[PDB]
Amino acid sequence: MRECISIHVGQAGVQIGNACWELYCLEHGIQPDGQMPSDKTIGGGDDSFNTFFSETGAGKHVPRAVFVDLEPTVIDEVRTGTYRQLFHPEQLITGKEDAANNYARGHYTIGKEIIDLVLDRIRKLADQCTGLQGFLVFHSFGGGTGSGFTSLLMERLSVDYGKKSKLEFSIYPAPQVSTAVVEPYNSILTTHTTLEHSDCAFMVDNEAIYDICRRNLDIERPTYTNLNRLISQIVSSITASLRFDGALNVDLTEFQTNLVPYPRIHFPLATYAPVISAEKAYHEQLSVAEITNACFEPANQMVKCDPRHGKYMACCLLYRGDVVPKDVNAAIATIKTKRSIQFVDWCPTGFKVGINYQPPTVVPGGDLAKVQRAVCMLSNTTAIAEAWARLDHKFDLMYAKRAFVHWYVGEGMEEGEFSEAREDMAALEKDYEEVGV
Amino acid sequence: DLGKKLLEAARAGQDDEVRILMANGADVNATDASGLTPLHLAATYGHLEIVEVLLKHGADVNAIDIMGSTPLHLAALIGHLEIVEVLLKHGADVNAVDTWGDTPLHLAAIMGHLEIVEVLLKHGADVNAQDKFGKTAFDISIDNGNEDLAEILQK
Amino acid sequence: MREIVHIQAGQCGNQIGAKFWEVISDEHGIDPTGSYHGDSDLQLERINVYYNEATGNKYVPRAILVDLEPGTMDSVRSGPFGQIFRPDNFVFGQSGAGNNWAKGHYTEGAELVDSVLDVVRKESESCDCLQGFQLTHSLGGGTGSGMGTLLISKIREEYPDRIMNTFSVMPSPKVSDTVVEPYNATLSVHQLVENTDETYCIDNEALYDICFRTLKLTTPTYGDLNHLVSATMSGVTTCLRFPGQLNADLRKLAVNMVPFPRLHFFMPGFAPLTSRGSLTVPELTQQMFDSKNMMAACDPRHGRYLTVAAIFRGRMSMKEVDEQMLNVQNKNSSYFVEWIPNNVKTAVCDIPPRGLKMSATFIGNSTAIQELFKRISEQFTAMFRRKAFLHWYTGEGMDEMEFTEAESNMNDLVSEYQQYQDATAD
Ligand SMILES: Nc1nc2c(ncn2[C@@H]2O[C@H](COP(=O)(O)OP(=O)(O)OP(=O)(O)O)[C@@H](O)[C@H]2O)c(=O)[nH]1
Ligand SMILES: Nc1nc2c(ncn2[C@@H]2O[C@H](COP(=O)(O)OP(=O)(O)O)[C@@H](O)[C@H]2O)c(=O)[nH]1
Ligand SMILES: COc1ccc(/N=N/c2cc(OC)c(OC)c(OC)c2)cc1O
Ligand SMILES: [Ca+2]
Ligand SMILES: [Mg+2]
């Protein structure tokens, strides 16, 4: 057992973090007050779920989570919600004036007024751990706090926790639910400043989740509640190996050994299947092969890109539920040939497989139907550079005219950081191209 | 010097003081340092009584300053409708041109004095007159989006 | 970001500011006594943005009343919502300005500005979380224009990081045939370019053409014009007064609408245009971008939109609104700048204004606003070329270079709108 600390920054990180911990408690059997009936050891434990949940003397299971936001509106709903009794009160840090969708406010002016308090509360959770292995950071790209404050936090965590791992669940901006016109700016600025300090980053394209809710969940206009419930379902499938028994991605160090061949290219692509609406409660049960085929369909990916346009450097399959290991081997043998899948020459063409024999848990009120078998594929492909190419283009269109730039220069930031961040992005696209895309 | 006193009297609107000075031989056609006569100031500051008085005592109705502004130019600019008609009744040049190519019709159209615009056209205002930039009174209405002004110029 | 300190200065500022407090109080359910006689608790969410909370469920507007003319003091008290203001927030002087921008800005108003500033602190320091200020005034006068811009600069010196917002009423010969108003407006625009973060351009010329030609009002009154002003100020402050999705922030509005600091003059629009006492989703979006619904005498089809914010109010399906806005962007793609991707933001609010079941408010940063500035500059140049009435201004201590610098600043402002109107992304 090696503990993981989850950090939620900004509205996007907090609201997705709220739905994630609700799903964790339903998967582990934890009640909103923190009571776990199927926990024999009281006051302590060596079990796998202890990597995410600490235990008090009264049998209370408290998440190892910190909620940070420069304004209190979003966190106040967590302070009065259903799971208000679950989280530590002193781990819900709120300011009074947010970053106003401005990277410079979150990183330089406003963020510095609360940065020392956030680290002291993170230090308190770290002192309770017997073997802290790393952090999980949830934040948005286009927000002022999610981009500016997170990069400042990632810089401080690398100094205090030098040898610890740090993973990201980032919210890629989408015009359908975007809040700011300068979100391409904040996305490029926080990437350049967090690239060195991050070991692995799972990007969540808001447009990809948007289309899945419209097409597969029959939702005419998806809200933040519909998106976050599907996102947390995929986040749980990714972190399930850290929370349960298994042999694939058992710790944070193994995540980058299996998915990150080189430090700068640490953006794996997540694919989830099946996504079935809850109104079809008597749907036909898809087989292991039919959900494995769906992992190589671009309409099921968490980031809108074309994987057959690029090359694979790593492929990991995480199954959940009624799954026989020989059925997976048969499904791979066909897909290994019947589909246009190309691995780079320097990578051993393989498919790592890990099976969890418990079917996924659905939250009451969600839009998903109960399934007896599901799969989450994590793959590092060069096709994910298309997301950077679409993001850098909107950056170039505005920065050429220096639009909205004065808002950033007026908050302690220098204009030279804009050109420095775009050059770092041009080298990143150049890193994917020199591998094969 | 009564010429300098008649300038200040015509501006402030002291009618009795204007009569006293002209009785003592004050130059009705005196000018200030910029070429403004008592008729210029009386027309600018809207003193209709002094306007009719000066015109009865040898005031040049078409005098110009260093910038070429007639009393009708200043009256059309500020918007003194009655003074405009009194000047025209005494032979004021309706198409006089200042150093910027502007006519009395240009200034009345720019400042939106529609009533004065209608009076100038009745007395024969040239609608084809161009300023230094080539704009006519019609061009000013089209470029300003003034539909009421363009309708008046399309009689 | 919550509390907003309202300030109204001058005869036009107090007049259009009184209508603002009458309309929004009807929407939030507040009687002139101050009690909350509403039927929905949605009217008390972020109610403290424009109101204080006194004992007895009594809500007091956070407004400060300024004017040099002592007659304006009794003009507000005798109104319907007249005695819902603090007697301590009435700051009035002995004599007026008489349409002289120099009197309000340098002499008379300089003696009363400190009397207002000390009242601003009492409201500001008693705020829980202040975000900015909004000012209603005209630019053609002497008090709201001369002292108004002076008061803005004095407030910014003590609140530098706060947002400054203004509702400026542009002069027009159709409503007021005074030849010194182009002097006052041009001198005030020289101040608004530097000391304000966002300015709504309410044009009396556009208001007259709406009442006279659209509303078929033969002799439009100030009440006819202010009916459109009060209906526009309510829509632009919809998010500032109700939850929805945009959580009401003057700063986040400016970050997303002002790409260049000098270009912070907004073109408001409203639909449907209704008279006094007297539409589908594809209908509201259509009129919202029509030249006949803009509160500024400018044709939006003569320029390009830098940023656009639209607020829909009433019962309507959220999906249909997203279809028409994307559809209008397609049919009118040539009127949006291609180097600002996704420059159109759509807002929605359940609570509509009274007397209406559906409405739409347009907030556009269009380059076509140069037509308005070219108009005031042309009137200014014609008057200044002949030095007419310039002694009325220099006698109060003003330098003649200030006129040449104010005209040079606005001509440069027009040139900047033209530079980006012709720029391409390639
Ligand atoms: N999927 C999802 N995305 C969200 C959610 N909330 C916000 N976002 C995204 O976050 C982006 C804006 O950043 P926010 O997180 O809302 O702002 P912030 O991090 O609080 O920083 P500030 O600008 O200071 O408020 C938008 O592009 C949204 O798409 C959410 O609940 N779910
Ligand atoms: N729309 C509108 N404009 C007004 C109103 N009152 C005055 N104005 C305009 O404001 C200008 C006069 O400025 P004013 O506010 O009276 O002078 P001040 O006392 O120095 O601020 C004129 O050009 C009017 O057209 C009003 O109630 N509504
Ligand atoms: C061109 O891109 C954008 C344009 C406008 C955007 N938001 N607009 C507003 C408008 C508001 O009131 C009118 C708000 O209430 C004060 C408001 O509070 C946050 C936001 C957002 C954009 O990404
Ligand atoms: Ca235990
Ligand atoms: Mg926020």
Counting the structural domains of chain A, the total is 2
| Amino acid residing at C235 | G
Q: Count CB atoms within 10 A of the CB of residue A357.
A: 11
Query: How far apart, in whole angstroms, are the C-alpha atoms of residue C178 and residue C174?
Result: 10
Q: Do C388 and B144 count as a contact with CB atoms less than 8 A apart?
A: no
Touching subunits of A (3+ CB pairs, under 8 Å) are: C
DSSP H or E run through A85: none
Q: Do C173 and B111 count as a contact with CB atoms less than 8 A apart?
A: yes
Counting the structural domains of chain B, the total is 1
For residue C81, the number of C-alpha atoms closer than 13 Å in the C-beta half-sphere is: 23
A222 and A128 in a single domain? The answer is yes
Query: How far apart, in whole angstroms, are the C-alpha atoms of residue C251 and residue C163?
Result: 6
| Amino acid residing at C140 | G
The residue assigned the tokens 């030095």 is C387
| Amino acid residing at A160 | D
Domains contained in chain C, CATH given: 3-268 (3.40.50.1440), 269-370 (3.30.1330.20)
Asked if the structure places residue A26 within a domain, the reply is yes
Let me know how long chain B is: 155
A207 and A328 in a single domain? The answer is no
| Amino acid residing at B137 | A
Please tell me whether residue C366 adopts helix, strand or coil conformation: strand
| Amino acid residing at A166 | K
Pick the closest to residue A146 from A285, A14, A296 (CA basis): A14
- What is the side-by-side strand order in the sheet with C3-9? C90-92, C63-67, C3-9, C130-138, C163-170, C198-203, C265-271, C358-366, C305-314, C344-349
Expressed in percent and rounded to 5, the helix, strand and coil fractions of chain A are 45, 15, 40
∠C339-C344-C347 over CA atoms, to 5°?
A: 160
Which residues of A form the catalytic set? 254
- What is the side-by-side strand order in the sheet with A269-273? A269-273, A373-381, A312-321, A352-356
Question: Longest Cα pair distance anywhere in chain A, in angstroms?
Answer: 64
Please tell me whether residue C229 adopts helix, strand or coil conformation: helix
CA A46 to chain centre: 26
A293 and A255 in a single domain? The answer is no
C218-227: b (≥16 Cβ within 10 Å) or e: eebebebbbb
Work out the angle between the directed axes of helices A385-399 and A183-194 (0-180°, nearest 10).
Answer: 120
Pick the closest to residue B6 from B15, B21, B16 (CA basis): B21
CATH number, position A352: 3.30.1330.20
For residue C77, the number of C-alpha atoms closer than 13 Å in the C-beta half-sphere is: 11
Query: How far apart, in whole angstroms, are the C-alpha atoms of residue A378 and residue A364?
Result: 27
Residue B30 vs residues B1, B18, B33, B65: alpha-carbon distances, Å: 11, 13, 10, 11
- What is the side-by-side strand order in the sheet with A65-69? A92-94, A65-69, A4-9, A134-140, A165-172, A200-205
Tokens representing C294 are 């803009």
A275 and A211 in a single domain? The answer is no
A35-57: b (≥16 Cβ within 10 Å) or e: ebeebeeeeebebbbbbbbbbee
Residue C153 vs residues C147, C170, C191, C192: alpha-carbon distances, Å: 10, 20, 8, 9
* Cβ-Cβ contacts under 8 Å for B65 (sequence gap 6 or more): B31, B34, B35, B36, B40
Q: Do B110 and C177 count as a contact with CB atoms less than 8 A apart?
A: no
A80 and A118 in a single domain? The answer is yes
Asked if the structure places residue A172 within a domain, the reply is yes
Q: Read off the DSSP letter of residue A345.
A: T
Pairing, β C305-314 against β C344-349: parallel
Cα A42 to ligand 4 centroid, rounded to whole Å = 5
For chain A, how far is it from start to end, CA to CA, in angstroms?
39
Asked if the structure places residue A295 within a domain, the reply is yes
CA C114 to chain centre: 24
Asked if the structure places residue A394 within a domain, the reply is no
Q: In this structure, which long-range contacts are made by residues A323-327, counting pairs with CB atoms below 8 Å and at least 24 apart in sequence?
A: A323/A288, A323/A355, A323/A357, A323/A373, A324/A288, A325/A353, A325/A355, A327/A287, A327/A288, A327/A289
DSSP H or E run through C361: strand C358-366
Whether A12 lines ligand 1, by a CB cut-off of 6 Å, is yes
Give strand pairing partners of B35.
none
CATH number, position A136: 3.40.50.1440
Q: Are C6 and C61 in contact (CB under 8 A)?
A: yes
∠B116-C383-B155 over CA atoms, to 5°?
A: 25
Q: Are C138 and C171 in contact (CB under 8 A)?
A: yes
Quote the minimal CA–CA distance from B143 to chain C in Å. Answer: 9
Q: Read off the DSSP letter of residue C111.
A: H
A250 and A278 in a single domain? The answer is no
Query: How far apart, in whole angstroms, are the C-alpha atoms of residue A218 and residue A196?
Result: 40
A253 and A376 in a single domain? The answer is no
Question: Residue C299 region, left (φ>0) first, then alpha (ψ -120 to 50), else beta?
Answer: beta
**Segments forming the whole domain that contains residue A359:** 269-385
Whether A145 lines ligand 1, by a CB cut-off of 6 Å, is yes
Q: Count CB atoms within 10 A of the CB of residue A117.
A: 13
| Amino acid residing at C185 | A
A46 and A81 in a single domain? The answer is yes
A198 and A70 in a single domain? The answer is yes
Tokens representing C376 are 């005031």
Method: X-ray
Residue C295 vs residues A7, C148, C227, C358, C363: alpha-carbon distances, Å: 48, 21, 12, 19, 10
**Segments forming the whole domain that contains residue B87:** 1-155
Q: Strands (DSSP E) along A304-427, which ranges? A: 312-321, 352-356, 373-381
A281 and A376 in a single domain? The answer is yes
Any C CB within 8 A of A280 CB = no
Q: Residues of A with CB below 8 A from C420's CB?
A: 401
Report resolution in angstroms.
Answer: 2.2
DSSP H or E run through C237: none
A245 and A300 in a single domain? The answer is no
A172 and A192 in a single domain? The answer is yes
Residue A399 vs residues A188, A191, A396: alpha-carbon distances, Å: 12, 17, 5
